[PDB]
Design a protein around this ligand. Structure first.
Ligand SMILES: [Mg+2]
Ligand SMILES: [Mg+2]
Lengths: 50, 191, 109, 138
RNA sequence: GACAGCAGGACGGUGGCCAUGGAAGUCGGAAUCCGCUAAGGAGUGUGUAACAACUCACCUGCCGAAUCAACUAGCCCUGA
């Protein structure tokens, strides 16, 4: 299962920030949902671990 | 606030020889030649220096968005100069669970054919870009190396591979399966 | 941090550098890559007796001795100065024996 | 030849080695009972109890449990009677007054490691170190 | 000489202290001083169940001129 490769796959699919209003996956450092459908809010939450 | 003449400084090394016919940039080097078309950008391009090959990218007036634009030309000319000297190399370790993933190169380095992909029966035939080669690397478990000149084409190929390997209707925090980009680098090392 | 505060923030280093300014001929230009372990005491303890080793930010020390010089010379320790982690044991002792003891006497010795 | 350096096995209050540990002395080495039963049997009688150093410094086909301590064990040593508790006796608080000189008499066999001068060094360091002793010498 | 970026560290009296279930700053508790300095928080955390590399706080080099934080109102967008 190779935990370094697990770190790589979790880097590509786990540690993202999810916006509470637009529900889009963004980036681990991002502050704002880039979508027009909510309008660039600063309302986020981290993506849930197992 | 309608600024004036922002200018970026692009050094050019000794091996490569640049030649522009307008906003169309044509670069020659050891690893093939290269060109792009910057027509829609409306920025003064000029070069100065007898065999020193300094390039300046100059935009007058503008807006804040266009002062943001004037650095992007500098960065793309930097990436073209890195490519035409060295070339870009993407190293991808395939991460597989209880099912293996078989990856073959079907014809001449262009076509990539992915199999067995979580036990799916569907053979996944993916067509890469023109101007880029792909090889299963040696001395490492299921590492796949893509080599090319234009970084947009090479990384679009890598994106096509990692979006060909995408898990449907499951958790994607479990089922961490796919072919992902692990390392970005140059063709010739130590440079 | 309000300039001097007469406390130990900014112009106490700019009291020590400029008040240990009239006791020496020969800043010595000791520089080490890392001192995180007991290397700190390896700098001071072996060179005690005449134990000094004081220099803060080289960014602080750009116009510092220039504006508060009044010593004419020893500003020929100019732009060869800033660069590199330099500790400055400014001394008053005999000849090169100081540098000789340091030619190795902290990191492997 | 068959010699090895220290491991610092302590945090115990008895002697001999926290149990009858003079039988499992053999193992992944070739040592022998040379200082597990005589010098520790005197060292408990000399500097009895209170979890000092006592490391294993094997030199030639034999053990060597020669004790080389430093501070905070040598300032927990500031006592005149150990009326033992054997466990759990209300966490017995030996916060005891020390005499006027912990400066030249309780520091001289302990020094060469404070990395300073003498008078501004070890003397002033042990006063900041003593967190079980503090009853104000004055 | 900030601001982010690259480079260096991130101690010692001191395996300090509550414990001996670990704790040698890393689940928890009281606290908390000082020295060396360029600065280290009797240590933000990563991670070995624990020992350890490691980072953060804090500090120094290359750098070059504006940068950061709140708050307000015009247009536009979300709300629709
Ligand atoms: Mg389901
Ligand atoms: Mg509207």
């Amino acid at each position: 299962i190779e935990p370094s490769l697990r770190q790589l796959a979790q880097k590509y699919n786990c540690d993202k920030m999810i916006c509470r209003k637009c529900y889009a996956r963004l980036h681990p450092r991002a502050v704002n949902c880039r979508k027009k459908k909510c309008g660039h809010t600063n309302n986020l939450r981290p993506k849930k671990k197992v | 606030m309608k600024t004036i003449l922002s200018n970026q400084t692009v050094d050019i090394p000794e091996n490569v020889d640049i030649t522009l016919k307008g906003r169309t940039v044509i670069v020659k080097g050891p690893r093939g030649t290269l060109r792009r078309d910057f027509n829609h950008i409306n920025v003064e391009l000029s070069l100065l220096g007898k065999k020193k090959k300094r390039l300046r990218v100059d935009k007058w007036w503008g807006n804040r968005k266009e002062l943001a634009t004037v650095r992007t030309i500098c960065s793309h000319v930097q990436n073209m100069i890195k490519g035409v000297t060295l070339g870009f190399r993407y190293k991808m370790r395939s991460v597989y669970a209880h099912f293996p993933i078989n990856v073959v190169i079907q014809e001449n380095g262009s076509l990539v054919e992915i199999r067995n992909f979580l036990g799916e029966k569907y053979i996944r035939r993916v067509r890469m870009r023109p101007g880029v080669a792909c090889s299963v690397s040696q001395a490492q478990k299921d590492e796949l190396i893509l080599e090319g000149n234009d970084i947009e084409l090479v990384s679009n190929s890598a994106a096509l591979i990692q979006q060909a390997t995408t898990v449907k209707n499951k958790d994607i925090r479990k089922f961490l399966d796919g072919i992902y980009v692990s390392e970005k680098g140059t063709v010739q090392q130590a440079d | 941090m309000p300039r001097e505060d007469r406390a130990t923030w900014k112009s106490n280093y700019f009291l020590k550098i400029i008040q240990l300014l009239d006791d020496y001929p020969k800043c010595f230009i000791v520089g080490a890559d890392n001192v995180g372990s007991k290397q700190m005491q390896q700098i001071r303890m072996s060179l005690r007796g005449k134990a000094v080793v004081l220099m803060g930010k080289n960014t602080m020390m750009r116009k510092a001795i220039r504006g508060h010089l009044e010593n004419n010379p020893a500003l020929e320790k100019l732009l060869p100065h800033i660069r590199g982690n330099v500790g400055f044991v400014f001394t008053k002792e005999d000849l090169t024996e100081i540098r000789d003891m340091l030619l190795a006497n902290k990191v492997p010795a | 030849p068959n010699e090895i350096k220290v491991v610092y096995l302590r945090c115990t209050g008895g002697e001999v080695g926290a149990t009858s540990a003079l039988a499992p002395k053999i193992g992944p080495l070739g040592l022998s009972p040379k200082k597990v039963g005589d010098d520790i049997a005197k060292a408990t009688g000399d500097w009895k109890g209170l979890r000092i150093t006592v490391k294993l410094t094997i030199q030639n086909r034999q053990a060597q449990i020669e004790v080389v301590p430093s501070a905070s064990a040598l300032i927990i040593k500031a006592l005149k009677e150990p009326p033992r508790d054997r466990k759990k006796q209300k966490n017995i608080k030996h916060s005891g007054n020390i005499t006027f000189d912990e400066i030249v008499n309780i520091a001289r066999q302990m020094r060469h490691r404070s990395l300073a001068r003498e008078l501004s060094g070890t003397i002033k360091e042990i006063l900041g170190t003593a967190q079980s002793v503090g009853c104000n010498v004055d």
